[PDB]
Amino acid sequence: AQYEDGKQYTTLEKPVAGAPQVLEFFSFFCPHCYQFEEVLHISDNVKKKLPEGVKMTKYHVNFMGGDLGKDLTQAWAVAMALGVEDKVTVPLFEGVQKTQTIRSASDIRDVFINAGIKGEEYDAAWNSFVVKSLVAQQEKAAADVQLRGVPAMFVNGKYQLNPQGMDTSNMDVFVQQYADTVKYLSEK
Incomplete structure (x- = not known):
């Protein structure tokens, strides 16, 4: 076949029910994730090949960068x-990754302030139970x-993209092979 399990994707030995249709995981510490965002624009190119009403979810992870990694997952929830x-x-x-000017939760906060989110608005969000459950999700x-x-990237809780292949x-x-694979899996 042109698309093969074990080749452009792998299948979960334990599939996940109720999952988002397209679920993407990243870390701000993750070097290929940087590429995927700035250079390859993966999420955007996957979107362009999916139908609409196909919802696209992107989550941050904790297992990179210790204490600051966890701050980033909360910031992403914000x-x-x-x-x-x-x-x-x-x-x-x-x-x-580039300027290495983020070393604390306050430096993360500075990024939002410079992007125009109001201090009061950020801190209230940061401390809200809506963001807490969003971190839990x-x-x-x-x-x-x-x-x-x-x-x-995971499609419908069953398939896992395999970019190495x-x-x-x-x-x-x-990028096109990647997006076409997501479209293929989506139709599966």
Whole structure:
């Protein structure tokens, strides 16, 4: 077959019920995740090939970067609650991996302030029980699928993208193969 289990994707030995249709995991400490966001624009290219009414979910993980990794998962919950993911993703990535100007929760907070989220608004979100359950959702979703690596994408709780089994000579060809695989799995 042109698409093969064990090749462009793998199947979960234990499938996950009730899962988001397209569920993506990342860390701001994760070097390929940086690529996926800034250089490859994976999430955006997957979206463009999916139908609409296909909801796309993106969660942060704890297992990289110790105490600051956990702060970032809470910050991502704040971003999701306020709907400002597209304003903080790039400066959070660059602040962690490029300029290395993010070393504490206060430095994360600075990124949101510079992006125009109000101090009062951020701190209230940071401390809200809506963000707490949002942190729990991110944790439970990663726990459900036995997650020890990012970037990771899961389709309908059964299929796991396998980018190592795709061509990387050309970055654009890689992205299309990746998005086409998600579309394939989506239709499965």
